[PDB]
């Protein structure tokens, strides 16, 4: 007789093969694939002239709402209906839903395409003890550049067009993670500052190089409301602005690479 044998043609391992697969497709389809739907659902679309249904599929695919209780007060519940109210200066290039949109203004300023930002909270990211998290080193006093690294304060910022566009006045540090995230510059020919996220900067000994945008385009870099603080949504505005240059700083960048 055999260990595991169940019938004329059944055995344990073989049944457990079946159960194994079931556990997997269960967790994957009924759990994880629904967890994936806590942002951006329900899918937005055109509209119908007459429609009346709590369209069933849109209910079935969603998980039950979850709520995070936020560390410094408040709650957030996901999923939730979060339509994009803001007007988008874009226009359909052809007819079909597949068709790409095109900017009708300055996409850098309009913030469409790679220049877009999320409607993040207009609040200031905090450290764990309540302080503003991302702040210039003027404010962040117990913070310092590590011995060995270029201190960009003083250095010129140089744009994609090769032209000096400003001068670095400060570095903003993350005090939760001890990590610089922006440089601040006095814009040349303006009395504004710009922050530029450190990822858009090539840090040389003698200059800071920024390829995303031409010197001209630093003028319309987004403006903070406070000057020693920055909100989550501003971080998004600032970052998206340079990202947009990567497609839009000059006319040929949107076109076929090769």
């Amino acid at each position: 007789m055999y260990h595991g044998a169940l019938a004329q043609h059944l055995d344990i391992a073989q049944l457990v093969w079946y159960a194994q697969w079931l556990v997997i497709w269960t967790v994957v389809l009924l759990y994880l694939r629904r967890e994936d739907r806590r942002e951006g659902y329900p899918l937005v679309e055109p509209l119908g002239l007459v429609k009346l249904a709590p369209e069933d599929g849109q209910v079935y695919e969603l998980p039950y709402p979850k709520t995070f209780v936020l560390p410094h007060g408040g709650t957030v519940t996901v999923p939730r209906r979060r339509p994009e109210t803001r007007e988008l200066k874009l226009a359909q290039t052809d007819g079909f839903e597949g068709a790409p949109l095109q900017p009708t203004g300055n996409p850098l300023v309009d913030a469409v395409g790679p220049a877009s930002y999320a409607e993040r909270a207009e609040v200031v990211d905090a450290t764990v003890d309540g302080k503003a998290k991302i702040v210039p080193l003027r404010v962040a006093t117990d913070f310092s550049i590590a011995e060995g690294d270029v201190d960009p304060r003083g250095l010129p910022v140089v744009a994609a067009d090769g032209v000096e566009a400003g001068t670095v006045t400060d570095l903003w540090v993350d005090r939760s993670e001890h990590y610089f995230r922006y440089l601040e510059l006095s814009v040349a020919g303006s009395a504004r500052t710009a922050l530029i996220p450190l990822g858009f900067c090539d840090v040389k000994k003698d200059k800071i190089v920024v390829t995303s945008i031409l010197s001209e385009q630093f003028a319309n870099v987004p403006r903070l409301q406070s000057r020693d603080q920055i909100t989550l949504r501003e971080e998004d505005k600032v970052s998206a602005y340079y990202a947009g240059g990567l497609l839009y700083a000059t006319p040929e960048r949107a076109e076929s690479l090769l």
Binding site: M1, Y2, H3, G4, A5, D11
Partner: protein, 332 residues
């Protein structure tokens, strides 16, 4: 530590199973050259004469040979085993029937064994056969022999280091690693498998599910048996200068038919053959040998796959002298 392209590859299994030999051309060449030293057959003599059984006195095995034939044999024997020493290695200088020296009687028994191998172990040695040269390679002590404990260097013509000496215990694990192609397998497949017929090489089940009655507790073969068998195969592979897929399709090591090559069945026979030589010819020779010869348990030196093969899938790349020396068998 590396070897340069190209490699010589063969195919031993259906395309896409990655089965075959992987040979470094230079190594093959160097073994080809060492094996090339097989002395050619002595010129054939016409058999004018009586049986040396009539002519000579103390001739037991080759008694039926004419005189000229017989001395031809004695010349080949001398050239294969004790060339540097000459006839006298075995004979009394002044009396040739004299069994005074142990090489005589040992050599006598080895003519018998040699004729056994060629007559009865045909399913292994086929029509290639062995001669004295196959093991001895021109010295009285064969270069590759096995004691009831691992020893190093494998070629006994090399000088042992301290650590290699069987007495240096700190060197045990290495003596063993070097007999199983450098694995750490803590078994000696020679004494477990090849010295005698006590152990079973197959360790893999032939049913999908565990049979009730042999599958629990002390009913079971310990996992160590699988390690052992692996060790043996590591050894065989290295002995033949080949890899598992010379014999197995690794899909199912336990299966024969399409899952095994002709060379696996030949190897199966060689295990049987080796056990016979060891148990019935070679082990008994501790009676007839000087202490000088014997190992730490008074065991005579014995044979494994290397003793003949010495690193090649066919000994001496398949050279034969079988039609040249019929004395040595097959004996009708």
């Amino acid at each position: 530590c590396f070897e340069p392209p190209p490699a010589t590859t063969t195919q031993t299994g259906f395309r896409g199973l990655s089965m075959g030999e992987v040979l470094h051309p230079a190594t093959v060449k160097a073994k080809k050259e060492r094996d090339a030293q097989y002395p050619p057959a002595l010129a054939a003599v016409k058999a004018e004469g009586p049986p040396v059984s009539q002519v000579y006195k103390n001739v037991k095995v080759l008694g039926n040979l004419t005189e000229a034939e017989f001395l031809r044999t004695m010349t080949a024997i001398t050239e294969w085993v004790s060339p540097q020493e000459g006839c006298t290695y075995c004979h009394d200088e002044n009396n040739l029937a004299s069994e005074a020296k142990y090489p005589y009687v040992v050599a006598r028994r080895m003519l018998e064994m040699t004729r056994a191998i060629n007559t009865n172990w045909t399913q292994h040695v086929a029509q290639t056969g062995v001669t004295c040269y196959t093991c001895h390679r021109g010295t009285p002590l064969p270069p590759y022999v096995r004691y009831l404990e691992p020893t190093l260097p494998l070629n006994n013509r090399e000088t042992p280091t301290h650590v290699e000496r069987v007495e240096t215990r700190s060197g045990y694990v290495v003596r063993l690693a070097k007999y199983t192609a450098y694995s750490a397998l803590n078994y000696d497949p020679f004494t477990m498998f090849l010295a005698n017929d006590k152990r079973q090489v197959r360790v893999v089940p032939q049913t999908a599910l565990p049979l009730v009655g042999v599958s629990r507790g002390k009913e079971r073969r310990p996992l160590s048996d699988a390690y052992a068998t692996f060790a043996l195969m590591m050894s065989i592979s290295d002995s033949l200068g080949t890899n598992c897929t010379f014999c197995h399709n690794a899909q199912t090591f336990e299966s024969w038919g399409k899952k095994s090559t002709p060379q696996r069945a030949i190897a199966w026979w060689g295990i049987r053959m080796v056990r016979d030589l060891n148990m019935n010819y070679l082990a008994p020779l501790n009676a007839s040998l000087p202490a000088s010869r014997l190992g730490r348990q008074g065991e005579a030196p014995q044979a494994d796959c290397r003793t003949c093969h010495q690193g090649v899938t066919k000994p001496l790349f398949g050279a034969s002298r079988l039609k040249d020396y019929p004395e040595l068998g097959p004996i009708k």
